[PDB]
Design a protein around this nucleic acid. Sequence first.
DNA 1: TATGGATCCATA
DNA 2: TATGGATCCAT
Lengths: 207, 210
Amino acid sequence: MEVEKEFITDEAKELLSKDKLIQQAYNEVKTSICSPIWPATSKTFTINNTEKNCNGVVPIKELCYTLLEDTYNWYREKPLDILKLEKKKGGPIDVYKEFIENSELKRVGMEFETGNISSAHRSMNKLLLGLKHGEIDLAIILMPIKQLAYYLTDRVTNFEELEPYFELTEGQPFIFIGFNAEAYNSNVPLIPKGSDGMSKRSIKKWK
Amino acid sequence: MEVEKEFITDEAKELLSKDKLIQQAYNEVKTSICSPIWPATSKTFTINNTEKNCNGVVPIKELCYTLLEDTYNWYREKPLDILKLEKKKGGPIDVYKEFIENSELKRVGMEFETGNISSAHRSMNKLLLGLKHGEIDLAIILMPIKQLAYYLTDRVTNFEELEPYFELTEGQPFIFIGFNAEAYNSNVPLIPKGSDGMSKRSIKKWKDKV
DNA sequence: TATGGATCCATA
DNA sequence: TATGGATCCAT
Ligand SMILES: [Ca+2]
Ligand SMILES: [Ca+2]
């Protein structure tokens, strides 16, 4: 997979240029988001482009989470204290890791988004909450760009649609990364779809 | 319907105490969110409680919207300049009205959220954007409470679930309203899901104003 | 290729 | 029991 678009707040740029741990942290996330391949036999991510919204999205996150977890030792589904300790409501963020050296400690929160675009607003808010309460020093969201999302399940998170809201992160170290497939062709298999929501396969007890 | 839970930021409290137009705005919203009644013929809103998620959410909003639009002159689909003009990306606000008393104008943005809880974060962030850029002076979000939502379409926005995030509206005038039915019974018809529960009512679009 | 939903899923 | 995801829908 490729990182095509990217927004980095002023506070995040300052860390990326002056702090090694954030540079290391940033390096590990980029290499991870680029990891997804398709099909399993390929070295690159190719998206089937037969029709609009033809591919499901479930398998996309796999390799990204494997590298982050297995190789980089990141923590999956990390619950925030503000959420499950104090307020006792809401779930954990996708990934989290503590970058340490000497007395310095940098905590990075992150969310990978292939859920509905509205789900990305929650993700941004959770990370904003975690940043406000001093649990993470940097927040990062990963999501497909519109060109790629056009071939994925209708209404999934796309960089361009969440973009008008990036400013709601002012004064806080945040980074938004939009990813894209390396090739677009009808020579590959369709990424399978679930029976979720309004899929013709979902059980609807109303008709 | 009943308004059972509510969070009012301190900035909104102040406006509600010192400003009569904001006081009027609130009362129109309050009366509108209490207007829904199940059995169109019924006095109050009784919700069928036979199963988990047994009712659709669309008809629940009809009376509230209709009172705000037709009786109180609120408009639907007010595009924000920051979104329509500057960023040229993003949809409009759900309900909008400009209050006037002489030289004073009070713009109130409001979203009636019966979408997925994740959609509520979009609603709040959009009102926050309108607020931050001085396009509105007060934001309002209507949503059922957890107990009511248990019998509504799975994962619908609910007061308690958005609650952890109310603090993100800090330093800005915002109102969160949680409503609930007056009764739960199995002898009232199910609120239909899908197209059956869609009203083909023409709404008062802001674009069609003067 | 726009946009806020409405609904049902999968895991706990 | 609760919570983050995923899939189409109506305009
Ligand atoms: Ca997650
Ligand atoms: Ca995610």
